[PDB]
């Protein structure tokens with residue numbers, strides 16, 4: 502079993518391949534790009550059929566260490582990787598089924614360059630700032646295109662409520678780590694995600710940027726539930742009193758806590774179908790090694806429950822006049838000003854709390870189709886659409 506110590510780049514890489522070697526049939530290690538200094542942003546994928554998207558099977562992801570000195574997310578992801586493989590081998594059906602019905606992508610470190618700087622300071626005592634930024638001195642969580650300005654306007658005066666476009670030269674305005682992550686987001690239809698931070702203990706959800714103050718999304722109720730699921734499954738987050746901060750239910754709207762623009766969280770929601778929340782897991786950004794095991798044991802149940810949350814709401818296929826799959830179709834839910842689209846295979850996913858909704862689907866060159874559906878508290882309900890040409 503992996504030791505509860507801090508793993509630097511080389512050990513992190515060895516760990517991922519070690520897990521892959523132990524569970525060859527359900528894992529795949531791949532890089533989404535290189536850091537400023539040449540380090541690979543390695544991702545470990547779990548699935549009973551790795552390397553391929555299966556229709557109606559949602560894709561989810563965990564991202565940690567975007568801030569070099571926030572190492573807990575990094576270690577929790579390495580421990581989680583070993584845990585998933587072990588439990589699969591133990592034949593724990595909760596985990597086996599999770600892996601069989603979901604495609605899980607784990608990125609332990611989005612800022613490997615910064616981590617090395619943080620780890621060398623002390624060592625392992627970077628304090629509040631050392632290694633936070635990437636090699637070019639840029640804060641990656643202030644490096645993503647700001648799409649909030651557009652959505653706030655569109656919510657007020659009307660207009661597109663999803664997949665806002667990036668600036669023409671975005672590839673030259675972002676850091677290599679950021680660019681790698683954005684291309685990654687463009688490569689898979691991620692449905693649910695969590696970015697792991699350090700510095701506080703609370704489940705942070707959209708929107709991060711203040712409208713001017715609490716700044717909710719059209720999916721506020723859902724996001725609160727998603728945040729609460731992690732908070733209440735977590736060992737002490739739900740307490741609300743951590744690091745001298747008080748957060749009722751251990752959750753918080755980002756903007757309400759403090760305004761933040763150009764962050765990765767809101768980018769996910771406004772540029773893709775992925776609903777992401779930010780999990781602050783510890784007052785100490787770089788905890789001592791003797792605390793890693795307690796943190797792991799206090800987080801694992803929540804880490805599993807959060808991923809299981811992707812299996813709720815509705816999902817289905819959007820078909821054209823010949824009954825062939827229709828990619829990029831738009832699915833909208835009455836009362837919720839935020840749509841989602843079908844992926845390349847024609848399948849779409851829509852997280853929703855229990856209730857009765859009026860759902861509609863459409864696509865360029867086709868006429869809308871509306872249906873009324875009932876969403877239960879358990880598994881998702883299959884809702885397909887057959888569109889006719891305009």
Ligand SMILES: *[C@H]1O[C@H](CO)[C@@H](O)[C@H](O)[C@H]1NC(C)=O
Nearest residue numbers: 857858859870871872873874
């Ligand atoms: C589905 O039923 C609801 C009422 O429960 C209705 O408002 C909605 O228009 C129906 N959908 C269609 C396509 O008629």
Ligand SMILES: *[C@H]1O[C@H](CO)[C@@H](O)[C@H](O)[C@H]1NC(C)=O
Nearest residue numbers: 856857858872873874875876
């Ligand atoms: C979905 O099921 C609920 C009962 O659970 C029912 O009230 C609702 O009308 C159903 N939706 C449609 C379109 O029939």
Ligand SMILES: *[C@H]1O[C@H](CO)[C@@H](O)[C@H](O)[C@H]1NC(C)=O
Nearest residue numbers: 874875876877880881882883
């Ligand atoms: C999908 O499941 C829901 C209950 O979760 C049910 O109300 C709905 O009718 C089901 N879809 C179909 C096509 O039966």
